[PDB]
Amino acid sequence: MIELSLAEALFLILFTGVISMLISRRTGISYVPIFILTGLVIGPLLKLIPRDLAHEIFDFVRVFGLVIILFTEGHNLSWRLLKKNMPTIVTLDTIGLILTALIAGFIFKVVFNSSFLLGFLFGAIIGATDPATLIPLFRQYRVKQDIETVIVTESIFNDPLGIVLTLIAISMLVPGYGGGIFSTLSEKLGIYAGGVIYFLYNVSVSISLGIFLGILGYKFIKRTGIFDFPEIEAFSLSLAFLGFFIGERLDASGYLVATVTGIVLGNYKLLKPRENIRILKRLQRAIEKEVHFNDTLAALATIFIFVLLGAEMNLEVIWSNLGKGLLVALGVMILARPLATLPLLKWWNFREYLFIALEGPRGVVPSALASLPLSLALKYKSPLLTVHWGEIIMATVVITVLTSVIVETLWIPILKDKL
Amino acid sequence: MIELSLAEALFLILFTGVISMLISRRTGISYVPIFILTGLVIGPLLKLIPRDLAHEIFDFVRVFGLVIILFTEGHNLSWRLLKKNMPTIVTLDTIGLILTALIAGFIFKVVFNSSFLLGFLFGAIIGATDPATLIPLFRQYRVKQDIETVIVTESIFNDPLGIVLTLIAISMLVPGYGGGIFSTLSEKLGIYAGGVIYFLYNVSVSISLGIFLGILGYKFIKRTGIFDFPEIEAFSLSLAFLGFFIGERLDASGYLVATVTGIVLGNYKLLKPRENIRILKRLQRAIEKEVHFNDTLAALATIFIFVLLGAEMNLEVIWSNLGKGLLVALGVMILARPLATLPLLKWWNFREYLFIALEGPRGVVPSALASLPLSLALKYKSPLLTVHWGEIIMATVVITVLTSVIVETLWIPILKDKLD
Numbered sequence A: 001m002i003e004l005s006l007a008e009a010l011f012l013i014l015f016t017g018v019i020s021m022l023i024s025r026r027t028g029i030s031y032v033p034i035f036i037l038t039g040l041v042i043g044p045l046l047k048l049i050p051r052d053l054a055h056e057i058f059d060f061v062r063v064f065g066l067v068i069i070l071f072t073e074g075h076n077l078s079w080r081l082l083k084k085n086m087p088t089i090v091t092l093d094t095i096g097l098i099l100t101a102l103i104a105g106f107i108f109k110v111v112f113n114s115s116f117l118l119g120f121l122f123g124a125i126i127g128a129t130d131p132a133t134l135i136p137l138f139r140q141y142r143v144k145q146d147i148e149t150v151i152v153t154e155s156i157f158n159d160p161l162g163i164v165l166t167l168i169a170i171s172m173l174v175p176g177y178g179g180g181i182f183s184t185l186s187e188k189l190g191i192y193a194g195g196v197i198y199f200l201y202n203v204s205v206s207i208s209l210g211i212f213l214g215i216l217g218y219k220f221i222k223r224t225g226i227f228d229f230p231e232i233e234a235f236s237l238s239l240a241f242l243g244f245f246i247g248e249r250l251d252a253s254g255y256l257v258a259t260v261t262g263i264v265l266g267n268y269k270l271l272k273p274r275e276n277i278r279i280l281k282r283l284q285r286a287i288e289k290e291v292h293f294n295d296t297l298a299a300l301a302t303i304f305i306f307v308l309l310g311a312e313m314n315l316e317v318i319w320s321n322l323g324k325g326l327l328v329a330l331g332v333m334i335l336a337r338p339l340a341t342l343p344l345l346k347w348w349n350f351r352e353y354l355f356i357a358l359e360g361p362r363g364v365v366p367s368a369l370a371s372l373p374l375s376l377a378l379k380y381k382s383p384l385l386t387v388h389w390g391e392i393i394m395a396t397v398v399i400t401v402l403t404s405v406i407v408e409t410l411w412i413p414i415l416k417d418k419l
Numbered sequence B: 001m002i003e004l005s006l007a008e009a010l011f012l013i014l015f016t017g018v019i020s021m022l023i024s025r026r027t028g029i030s031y032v033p034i035f036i037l038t039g040l041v042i043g044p045l046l047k048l049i050p051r052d053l054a055h056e057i058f059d060f061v062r063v064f065g066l067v068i069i070l071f072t073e074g075h076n077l078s079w080r081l082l083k084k085n086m087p088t089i090v091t092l093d094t095i096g097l098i099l100t101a102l103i104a105g106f107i108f109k110v111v112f113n114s115s116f117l118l119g120f121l122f123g124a125i126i127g128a129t130d131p132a133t134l135i136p137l138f139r140q141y142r143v144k145q146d147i148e149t150v151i152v153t154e155s156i157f158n159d160p161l162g163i164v165l166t167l168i169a170i171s172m173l174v175p176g177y178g179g180g181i182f183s184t185l186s187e188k189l190g191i192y193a194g195g196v197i198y199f200l201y202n203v204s205v206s207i208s209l210g211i212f213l214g215i216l217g218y219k220f221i222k223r224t225g226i227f228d229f230p231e232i233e234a235f236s237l238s239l240a241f242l243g244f245f246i247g248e249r250l251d252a253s254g255y256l257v258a259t260v261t262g263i264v265l266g267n268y269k270l271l272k273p274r275e276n277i278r279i280l281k282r283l284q285r286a287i288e289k290e291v292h293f294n295d296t297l298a299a300l301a302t303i304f305i306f307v308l309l310g311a312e313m314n315l316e317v318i319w320s321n322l323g324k325g326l327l328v329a330l331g332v333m334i335l336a337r338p339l340a341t342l343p344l345l346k347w348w349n350f351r352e353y354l355f356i357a358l359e360g361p362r363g364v365v366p367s368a369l370a371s372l373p374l375s376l377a378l379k380y381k382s383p384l385l386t387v388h389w390g391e392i393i394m395a396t397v398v399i400t401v402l403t404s405v406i407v408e409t410l411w412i413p414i415l416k417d418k419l420d
C-alpha cells in the first residue's frame, strides 16, 4: 500500500496488465484468467488496490471502455459474411439471447433462492459472449470458417444487446435509475408488455440513429476532407461518443448506437460512394489508422476491465458460495445454452449445433456489468437489490466467466476430432 | 457547484475541440486562439462547463497530458542535428530559459507590484516554448532547415525544464509541495543555493534515469519481440509513465524522464550498429505504431488543455488588468526573449538571431501550468501565495499566450523577408 492511491493504482493496472498480456501471448494461455489472476494479486491479495478505488475507476472504465469496445467490435465486422449466414445468427440474438437469459435466470433463482427478476439480472448481465479466446486456437487448429464467422458475429451483435437487457432489468428493481420513456410506458402498460415495447423501441431507435450518424459522419469525412492525422482518429472518437450521448439523451442504448456506427464505418465499401479512386484509397488509409488507434484504446479498456474485475472481487463471498457459483456456471454453459440454441438446429447438423451452442464463453461485457448491480445498490439502496445480492451476482458472474473461459478453451481439440 | 454531467462535459470538450481543430486547419487560423475561444464559449459565457469542474478536470489533464505530450515530443528529436548544433540549443535551454524566466519575472514584479517569487513563478511558467503553431508558415515559406531544427529542439528540451523551474517556484511558495531533497538543501544552504543544487540534481537524475529506462526498454522490446499490435503501444505507454512515477519518487521531474525516454526511443538506430536489417524493419514498424497512438493521445491532450484553459478563465479579472497583462506580455516578447538570446549570435548572424529571438511563442506547457498556482491556492493555505494573485498569474499567462502566439505567428512574413 506504499503506492499512490489513485494515479499509481491506475498505472499499476496498466503496467501489470501489459506484462500479463505479454506473458499471455508468450505462454499461449488465455488472457482472461491471466488478467483476473493479476487483479487478484494486486487487489485482494497484496492489498495494493482496495475495492473502493476499484469501484471508482470501474465507474468510468465501464462507460468509456464498453463504448469504445463495442465501437471497435463494430469496426471489425464484414456485413457480407453476415448476410451469407444471416437467419441462424439474427434469431439467436433476437430470441436465443433472451431465452438463455431467462433459463440462466431461473437456474440462478432456484439455487440462490431469490426473485426471477434478480436471476434475470444475472442472465442479462451474462448474456453477451466473447470468442476472442478461441480464435488464437482456431487459426492453428484449422477449424471450419463457417462457424467462426457466425460465432464472432453473434458476439458482435449480442454484446450491446446484453447491456440493454441489463439496463432494463436493473431499471425495474430500482425506480430512480430508470427514467423518461421507460417509466411512463411501464406505468401505463405494466412491466412485461411495456418492457417488451420499450425493448423494441430502444433497439429500433438505436439502429436507426446508428446508421444515420454513421452515414452522416462518413459523408462528412468526404465533404470536408478528413483523411490526415490527427483529425480522423479524434473525429471518429467524437463520432462514437456523439452517437452514445445523443443516443442516450433521447433514452436509448447509446452502446448499440456506437456499435451500429462502428458497423457503418467498418463497412464503408458498401455505402455506394460513386467517388474517385484517390479519395477512396486515402480514405482506406485514414480508416485503417483510426481503427488502429481506437482498437488500441479498446485493448487498454479490455485489460483495465478484466484486471479491475479481478481486483474488485472478494474471496470471502466467492469461497462461501463456490459450489453454487460453479453449479450456475455449468448450468448456463451445459444446460441453458444448448436449449437456447434449439432454433439453430434447423439450419445446422446435430453435432454442429451442439458445437456452436456449447462453445460460447462469457468475457468482457459480463465482466464490465458484474459490479454494476453492486455499485448501484450501494448508492441507490433498494430492498429488492441490496449489497448482499450485489456481492452474490458479481461473484457468480466472475465464477462463470472464469469457468466458461478455461473449460471451453480446453475442450476444443478433442471436440474438433469428434466432429 | 457542478451542473452538467461529467461524461457529457468531457465529451462536449472533446467534440467542440475537434470541430474547432477542423475549422482551425481549414481557415488557417492558429489552433490556440481557436481552442481558447471555443472553451471560452462553452466555459464562462454559457456556463456549460463550471469553473470548478474545469479545475477538477484540468488537475488530471495536466498530469496525463503533459507526460504523454512530452514523451511523444521526445521522439521528434534528432541526435545528429543535436550534435551538429549542440552549443546553441544548450545555451538556449539552460542560460536562455533561466534568464527568460528571471527577466520576465522581474517585469511581472514591477508591473503588478509583486514579490520576486511570484514573478519568478510566472516567468518559469511562460519559460517553455511551442513552435508547433509556426511549422506550417515555416514549411510554406521554405525557411532555413537549420533555424527550424534549432527552434524545435529548443522546444523539446526546454518544455520539461520549464516545469522544473515552475516546480522550484511552486515549492518556494507552498510548504507541502517541496519534497525531500529540495527541502533539505533549502534548510541547509538557503533558497538560492538550495534551488540551484536541486535544479542540477533534478536535471541530472531525470536525464540519466531517462537514458537508462530508454535503453532498458529498447533492449526489452528487441529481446521479447514487442513488434506488433497491441503490445508496442501499451508497453511504450507503460514505460512513458513508468519514467514519470519513478522519477517523481526520486523527487525529480518525471516529465523530464519521460522526455529523455522518448529521446532515446526516437533514436533507436543509433544505439546499436551492425544490427540486422530485418530487425530495423520490425523495430521501425513497432516504433511507428507507438508514435501514431501516443501522438494521437498527445493531440487529444493538447486539445483538452487549450480548451480547458479557455473554459477556466474569468473575464472579470482579465479585463480588469488587460493592459497590465498585455504590458508584461510585450515585455516578454520584445525584451525578455531576445535579451536572454543575446549570446546566441556567437554562432549566428544578427538577422538569424533576431528571428530566433522574436519567433518563440508560448503554447501548451504554460497553458497547462496557468492555473496551477491558483489551484494550489484553493487547495492549500500559504501566507505567500494567495487566491487573487493566482488569478493574476493565470490571467497574465493567458494574455501572454494569446498575444505571443497571435503576433509572433502573424509577423512571420514581414520579419522573414527583412531578415532572410
Ligand SMILES: CCCCCCCCO[C@@H]1O[C@H](CO)[C@@H](O)[C@H](O)[C@H]1O
Pocket (backbone or CB within 6 Å): A229, A288, A289, A292, B285, B288, B289, B290, B291, B292, B295
Ligand atoms: C506526424 C507524425 C505522427 C505519426 C503519423 C503517422 C501517420 C500514419 O499512421 C500509421 O497508421 C498505420 C495504421 O495501420 C500504422 O500501422 C502505422 O504504424 C502508422 O504510422
Ligand SMILES: CCCCCCCCCCC
Pocket (backbone or CB within 6 Å): A319, A320, A321, A322, A323, A324, A326
Ligand atoms: C461458508 C463456507 C461454505 C463452503 C462452501 C465451499 C464450496 C466449495 C464447493 C467445491 C465444489
Ligand SMILES: [Tl+]
Pocket (backbone or CB within 6 Å): A073, A128, A129, A130, A131, A155, A156, A159
Ligand atoms: Tl463480444
Ligand SMILES: [Tl+]
Pocket (backbone or CB within 6 Å): B073, B129, B130, B131, B155, B156, B159
Ligand atoms: Tl514544446
